[PDB]
Amino acid sequence: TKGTSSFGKRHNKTHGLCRRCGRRSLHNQKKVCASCGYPAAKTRKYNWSEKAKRRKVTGTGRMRYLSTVPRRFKNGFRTGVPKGARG
Amino acid sequence: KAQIKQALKKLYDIDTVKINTLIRPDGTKKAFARLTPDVDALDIAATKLG
Amino acid sequence: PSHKTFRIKQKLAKAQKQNRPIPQWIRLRTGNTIRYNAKRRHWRKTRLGL
Amino acid sequence: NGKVKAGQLWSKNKEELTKILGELKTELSQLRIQKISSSGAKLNKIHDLRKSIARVLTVINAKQRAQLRLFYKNKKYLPLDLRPKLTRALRRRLSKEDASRVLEKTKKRLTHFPQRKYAVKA
RNA sequence: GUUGACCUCGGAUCAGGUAGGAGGACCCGCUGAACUUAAGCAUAUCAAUAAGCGGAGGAAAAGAAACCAACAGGGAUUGC
RNA sequence: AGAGACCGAUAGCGCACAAGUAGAGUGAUCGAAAGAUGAAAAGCACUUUGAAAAGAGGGUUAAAUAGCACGUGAAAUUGUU
RNA sequence: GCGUGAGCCCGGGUCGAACGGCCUCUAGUGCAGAUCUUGGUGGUAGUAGCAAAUACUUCAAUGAGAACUUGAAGGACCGAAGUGGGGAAAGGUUCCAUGUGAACAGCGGUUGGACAUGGGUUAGUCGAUCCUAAGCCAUAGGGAAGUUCCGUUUCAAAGGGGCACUCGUGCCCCGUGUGGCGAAAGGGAAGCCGGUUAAUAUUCCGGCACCUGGAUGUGGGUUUUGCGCGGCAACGCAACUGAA
RNA sequence: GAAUAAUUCUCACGCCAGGUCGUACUCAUAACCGCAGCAGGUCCCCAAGGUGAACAGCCUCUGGUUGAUAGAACAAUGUAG
RNA sequence: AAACUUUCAACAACGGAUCUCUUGGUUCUGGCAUCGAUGAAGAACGCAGCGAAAUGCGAUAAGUAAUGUGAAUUGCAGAAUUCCGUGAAUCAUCGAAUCUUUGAACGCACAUUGCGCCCGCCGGUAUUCCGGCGGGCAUGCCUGUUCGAGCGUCAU
Ligand SMILES: [K+]
Ligand SMILES: [K+]
Ligand SMILES: [K+]
Ligand SMILES: [K+]
Ligand SMILES: [K+]
Ligand SMILES: [K+]
Ligand SMILES: [K+]
Ligand SMILES: [K+]
Ligand SMILES: [K+]
Ligand SMILES: [K+]
Ligand SMILES: [K+]
Ligand SMILES: [K+]
Ligand SMILES: [K+]
Ligand SMILES: [K+]
Ligand SMILES: [K+]
Ligand SMILES: [K+]
Ligand SMILES: [K+]
Ligand SMILES: [K+]
Ligand SMILES: [K+]
Ligand SMILES: [K+]
Ligand SMILES: [K+]
Ligand SMILES: [K+]
Ligand SMILES: [K+]
Ligand SMILES: [K+]
Ligand SMILES: [K+]
Ligand SMILES: [K+]
Ligand SMILES: [K+]
Ligand SMILES: [K+]
Ligand SMILES: [K+]
Ligand SMILES: [K+]
Ligand SMILES: [K+]
Ligand SMILES: [K+]
Ligand SMILES: [Mg+2]
Ligand SMILES: [Mg+2]
Ligand SMILES: [Mg+2]
Ligand SMILES: [Mg+2]
Ligand SMILES: [Mg+2]
Ligand SMILES: [Mg+2]
Ligand SMILES: [Mg+2]
Ligand SMILES: [Mg+2]
Ligand SMILES: [Mg+2]
Ligand SMILES: [Mg+2]
Ligand SMILES: [Mg+2]
Ligand SMILES: [Mg+2]
Ligand SMILES: [Mg+2]
Ligand SMILES: [Mg+2]
Ligand SMILES: [Mg+2]
Ligand SMILES: [Mg+2]
Ligand SMILES: [Mg+2]
Ligand SMILES: [Mg+2]
Ligand SMILES: [Mg+2]
Ligand SMILES: [Mg+2]
Ligand SMILES: [Mg+2]
Ligand SMILES: [Mg+2]
Ligand SMILES: [Mg+2]
Ligand SMILES: [Mg+2]
Ligand SMILES: [Mg+2]
Ligand SMILES: [Mg+2]
Ligand SMILES: [Mg+2]
Ligand SMILES: [Mg+2]
Ligand SMILES: [Mg+2]
Ligand SMILES: [Mg+2]
Ligand SMILES: [Mg+2]
Ligand SMILES: [Mg+2]
Ligand SMILES: [Mg+2]
Ligand SMILES: [Mg+2]
Ligand SMILES: [Mg+2]
Ligand SMILES: [Mg+2]
Ligand SMILES: [Mg+2]
Ligand SMILES: [Mg+2]
Ligand SMILES: [Mg+2]
Ligand SMILES: [Mg+2]
Ligand SMILES: [Mg+2]
Ligand SMILES: [Mg+2]
Ligand SMILES: [Mg+2]
Ligand SMILES: [Mg+2]
Ligand SMILES: [Mg+2]
Ligand SMILES: [Mg+2]
Ligand SMILES: [Mg+2]
Ligand SMILES: [Mg+2]
Ligand SMILES: [Mg+2]
Ligand SMILES: [Mg+2]
Ligand SMILES: [Mg+2]
Ligand SMILES: [Mg+2]
Ligand SMILES: [Mg+2]
Ligand SMILES: [Mg+2]
Ligand SMILES: [Mg+2]
Ligand SMILES: [Mg+2]
Ligand SMILES: [Mg+2]
Ligand SMILES: [Mg+2]
Ligand SMILES: [Mg+2]
Ligand SMILES: [Zn+2]
């Protein structure tokens, strides 16, 4: 009766939605994410998988703050306004 | 509901007796406001609103 | 089930606002290559993971 | 109309800016309320109105910060958002005064034996 | 007896500060294999390598002799 | 940022395209296919048969032996003569 | 047409933007096989088959088209441990109305859980929220090169209650003990009847109630020697001071 | 704490307020899991008349279905009776 | 003699080889040194006159200010400027701002849009109750301040 009959009894959930990475990988009883390692302070990452590292490395998101640093560096991290501007 | 009641009074100068709310399947909130019986809702919907 | 939490309710709302065809005027722009919607989902075909 | 221009905003105090902001706000709400059951040339007025609101908020904010910076001039401690933001590492560096100090003994040596300007003939 | 010191140990949403995470191609350490070769196999080899852990920068590390030599003596470190 | 006795869409990176996307797995993880109308849409007005999809005329174009199932259009396999 | 041969050259048709001969240089350079890799296509073949769960028939209407669409009339099955009326887990709009070429419903289709456009979920009383269970994790401390392992009251200086404030600042008591998460079936304050929509209702409308918290005034009760009377009794009565 | 008023009287009546999230529909020979509109699997509440010891089998009421590709013929060999 | 099977050609099918093309890869060489508690990298939810995705942005939301240029955007529509001066644009540049819920993530928690405490202002008869608004409350360690403990210990 292993197989088709036993497959009918599957109506529970081992994993739920993680609060940090968003995948359905948070273990319900252990309360530990199988993907990012929440709630540890560091993020889970291993060198035996290069594919997994590249799926979430820097640059795969929005870069909301880090993408404006090269422009500020080139101009010397200056402050002020251009000469006789209005306002 | 406490914020809805104060806003309607400030905006249109209307009074209510009770307010019911729900959240729609599309993620937005809809509120039912019942006026005091001495004011006609049909009149308000024409003077204010449209 | 009728018992839901607010996080699951929020997810279900977004999944059905993302399930409409493309407007007609998109297909008449210069240098267009989009024909249809390639991410259409149906409750009888593919299961969304929560 | 419903389209204000930043040129005239810069020459006003806060009282005018606040009441202009209020008048712009009520008008935008009314057009939203009566937006349904019709459609026409009022459709672009809402776009002009919400952009006009952004301009007034910007001018109010800028005039406030200028006054605050004048207040904290010649003070030892300033609020965090008025302090310069260079970079975390750039903010921890030794100041130029401290990084260029020397001992008494090495200073006396530079007074009497610095590098010289010289040439060697062929 | 009163009062005043010293030493050690504590409280405070006391005044002012500072660390964690990301990145890790290259750099400084710790810990640590087996497949394989020996026509078998245990010392050996693969290798003071892969995987695991901690710490930095535009370079890091090393560095002004308790050195090399045995000469008619050289003279901090690094690289070809 | 500049280049090459490199590859030319089953090649070159898994990805020349809304690609680490769609999809599979409880999970760690696995992971594609898919480029080319014409110089210019000038992307077929009107009449007629049909319930409609469409057909027959008639038009545009250098070309429809280029009609969006779109450059060229091989073989396996199939229809008529 | 040429060459022993691998091959080379020309005529006819289709087509639309680049290509060759000779001497040197260079290589990811020559396919029938690997139960070879990717893609495409045959014979078999209009073949095997589309046979559990008793079953359909007449008239009319719609429509290009009706066995499996709608009305009426007959004939039947489920037979209250139901093919009935409601829920928990799981799904996520599948719910309602209007309309519709193709594709899907292994026959058909004017019908659809399919396709297009709009609409729909109303609470102080039903739940969650509060409590703890098996269990999980912080704090004091001890291991481990380290990611971290143990430890839950311990070999710890571990709390909370009141009063005025000129106005917070100031006074005075008690002390053995001192965190959180964990149940939509355990524990637990409080709502019933009638009506209403295409689609919600113990939630909307009408009538009639209840619980908790907070302020407070009338009536009544007690006290002229201060905090109620009655009954042998079991006890009764609208009240009828009470800190550590 | 009273002798003219006092009463921190658990008595009657009277004043004010009660925030936040779920609520549609199915729960299965088509809305869940088995690659699917699969004779499999998946926790509960309500429970009529007759025969009969009876929630046995058999017939009926309320409620619900008439849905599983069809038409014609009756050879061998089969499956079921 | 037809039909059927088989072979070749023309035209018509099925399928996407071949030829030519390329806003893409790959390898080498040269220049530079800049993330974060002043809240990063990553995640979620929203924002357009008509948008599902992709790109951009954050309730000031398909963007605001400032500087330069000098007449557009374009699938449709409307409207604005039309270069006087008060200036088109998904333009270029970028020194001033805004920046939802989270995340090392910080009042305690979180499978909950759950439950608290302190200070101030505004309403409801109110220091104590209810509602709205603004500002706050994690841990380890350093320097300083102030309040303390101990017959550890000095003098009087
Ligand atoms: K101290
Ligand atoms: K590399
Ligand atoms: K490692
Ligand atoms: K590929
Ligand atoms: K999946
Ligand atoms: K020509
Ligand atoms: K022609
Ligand atoms: K052609
Ligand atoms: K030819
Ligand atoms: K057939
Ligand atoms: K049957
Ligand atoms: K039946
Ligand atoms: K409630
Ligand atoms: K009420
Ligand atoms: K809840
Ligand atoms: K609550
Ligand atoms: K316990
Ligand atoms: K430790
Ligand atoms: K409970
Ligand atoms: K309704
Ligand atoms: K009285
Ligand atoms: K009495
Ligand atoms: K309901
Ligand atoms: K219901
Ligand atoms: K259920
Ligand atoms: K019976
Ligand atoms: K019986
Ligand atoms: K027979
Ligand atoms: K037979
Ligand atoms: K090619
Ligand atoms: K976006
Ligand atoms: K809780
Ligand atoms: Mg389990
Ligand atoms: Mg100014
Ligand atoms: Mg509600
Ligand atoms: Mg402080
Ligand atoms: Mg670190
Ligand atoms: Mg090897
Ligand atoms: Mg060997
Ligand atoms: Mg061997
Ligand atoms: Mg061996
Ligand atoms: Mg390593
Ligand atoms: Mg750095
Ligand atoms: Mg160097
Ligand atoms: Mg150094
Ligand atoms: Mg020395
Ligand atoms: Mg020497
Ligand atoms: Mg040397
Ligand atoms: Mg190149
Ligand atoms: Mg291809
Ligand atoms: Mg490729
Ligand atoms: Mg092509
Ligand atoms: Mg034609
Ligand atoms: Mg041609
Ligand atoms: Mg074709
Ligand atoms: Mg062609
Ligand atoms: Mg052929
Ligand atoms: Mg061409
Ligand atoms: Mg080869
Ligand atoms: Mg071959
Ligand atoms: Mg061979
Ligand atoms: Mg047959
Ligand atoms: Mg069948
Ligand atoms: Mg059969
Ligand atoms: Mg039938
Ligand atoms: Mg029966
Ligand atoms: Mg029967
Ligand atoms: Mg329906
Ligand atoms: Mg219909
Ligand atoms: Mg069919
Ligand atoms: Mg059909
Ligand atoms: Mg149909
Ligand atoms: Mg649909
Ligand atoms: Mg209750
Ligand atoms: Mg622990
Ligand atoms: Mg320890
Ligand atoms: Mg709890
Ligand atoms: Mg219960
Ligand atoms: Mg009360
Ligand atoms: Mg007592
Ligand atoms: Mg219903
Ligand atoms: Mg049921
Ligand atoms: Mg079934
Ligand atoms: Mg299924
Ligand atoms: Mg009997
Ligand atoms: Mg039959
Ligand atoms: Mg037999
Ligand atoms: Mg942030
Ligand atoms: Mg906001
Ligand atoms: Mg606040
Ligand atoms: Mg600190
Ligand atoms: Zn996670």
Coordinates of N, CA and C (backbone and C1' of nucleotides) in Angstrom, one line a residue, chain A residues 23 34-36 43-58 60, chain E residues 22-24, chain F residues 14 20 28-31, chain I residues 42:
Chain A
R23 N 11.7 32.5 0.7 CA 11.4 31.2 0.2 C 10.6 30.4 1.2
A34 N 16.0 26.5 6.0 CA 16.9 25.6 5.4 C 17.7 26.2 4.2
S35 N 17.5 27.5 3.9 CA 18.1 28.2 2.8 C 19.1 29.3 3.3
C36 N 18.6 30.2 4.1 CA 19.5 31.3 4.5 C 19.9 31.2 6.0
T43 N 24.5 34.6 7.1 CA 23.8 34.0 6.1 C 24.4 32.7 5.6
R44 N 23.7 31.7 5.4 CA 24.2 30.4 5.1 C 24.8 30.4 3.7
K45 N 26.0 29.8 3.5 CA 26.7 29.9 2.3 C 27.9 28.8 2.3
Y46 N 28.0 28.1 1.3 CA 29.0 27.0 1.2 C 29.8 27.1 -0.1
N47 N 31.1 26.7 -0.1 CA 31.9 26.7 -1.2 C 31.8 25.5 -2.1
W48 N 31.1 24.4 -1.7 CA 30.9 23.3 -2.6 C 29.8 23.5 -3.6
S49 N 29.1 24.7 -3.6 CA 28.1 25.0 -4.6 C 28.4 26.4 -5.1
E50 N 28.9 26.5 -6.3 CA 29.0 27.8 -6.9 C 27.7 28.4 -7.5
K51 N 26.9 27.5 -8.0 CA 25.6 27.9 -8.5 C 24.8 28.6 -7.4
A52 N 24.7 28.0 -6.2 CA 23.9 28.6 -5.1 C 24.5 30.0 -4.7
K53 N 25.8 30.2 -4.7 CA 26.4 31.4 -4.4 C 26.0 32.5 -5.4
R54 N 26.0 32.2 -6.7 CA 25.7 33.2 -7.7 C 24.2 33.5 -7.8
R55 N 23.3 32.7 -7.2 CA 21.9 33.0 -7.3 C 21.6 34.1 -6.3
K56 N 22.4 34.4 -5.3 CA 22.0 35.5 -4.3 C 23.2 36.4 -4.0
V57 N 24.2 36.5 -4.9 CA 25.3 37.4 -4.6 C 24.9 38.8 -4.8
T58 N 25.8 39.8 -4.4 CA 25.5 41.2 -4.6 C 25.4 41.5 -6.1
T60 N 22.3 41.0 -7.7 CA 21.1 40.3 -8.2 C 19.9 41.0 -7.7
Chain E
rA22 P 27.2 37.8 6.5 O5' 27.3 38.7 5.3 C5' 26.2 38.9 4.4 C4' 26.5 40.1 3.4 C3' 27.5 39.8 2.3 O3' 27.0 39.1 1.2 C1' 28.0 41.9 3.4
rG23 P 27.9 38.0 0.5 O5' 29.2 38.8 0.0 C5' 29.3 39.5 -1.2 C4' 30.7 40.1 -1.4 C3' 31.8 39.1 -1.5 O3' 32.0 38.7 -2.9 C1' 32.4 40.7 0.1
rG24 P 32.3 37.1 -3.2 O5' 33.7 36.9 -2.5 C5' 34.9 37.5 -3.0 C4' 36.0 37.3 -2.0 C3' 36.5 35.8 -1.8 O3' 37.3 35.3 -2.8 C1' 36.2 36.9 0.3
Chain F
rG14 P 28.2 26.8 -20.7 O5' 26.7 27.1 -20.4 C5' 25.7 26.1 -20.6 C4' 24.3 26.6 -20.2 C3' 23.9 27.9 -20.8 O3' 23.5 27.8 -22.1 C1' 23.3 27.8 -18.5
rG20 P 18.8 36.9 -15.4 O5' 19.7 36.1 -14.4 C5' 19.1 35.6 -13.1 C4' 18.4 34.3 -13.4 C3' 17.7 33.8 -12.1 O3' 16.4 33.2 -12.5 C1' 19.1 32.1 -13.1
rA28 P 15.4 24.5 -0.7 O5' 16.9 24.1 -0.5 C5' 17.5 24.3 0.8 C4' 18.7 23.3 0.9 C3' 19.6 23.3 -0.2 O3' 20.6 24.3 -0.2 C1' 19.1 21.1 0.4
rU29 C1' 19.0 21.9 -4.7 C3' 21.0 22.6 -5.7 C4' 21.2 22.6 -4.2 O3' 22.1 22.2 -6.4 C5' 21.7 23.9 -3.8 O5' 21.8 23.9 -2.4 P 21.1 25.0 -1.5
rC30 P 22.4 22.8 -7.9 O5' 21.3 22.1 -8.8 C5' 21.3 20.7 -9.1 C4' 20.1 20.3 -9.9 C3' 20.0 20.9 -11.3 O3' 20.8 20.4 -12.3 C1' 17.9 20.9 -10.3
rG31 P 21.5 21.3 -13.4 O5' 20.3 22.1 -14.1 C5' 19.5 21.5 -15.0 C4' 18.3 22.3 -15.4 C3' 18.6 23.6 -16.1 O3' 19.0 23.5 -17.4 C1' 17.0 24.1 -14.4
Chain I
rG42 P 21.5 43.6 -3.6 O5' 20.7 42.6 -2.7 C5' 20.7 41.2 -3.0 C4' 20.0 40.4 -1.9 C3' 18.5 40.4 -2.0 O3' 17.9 39.7 -3.0 C1' 19.2 40.7 0.2

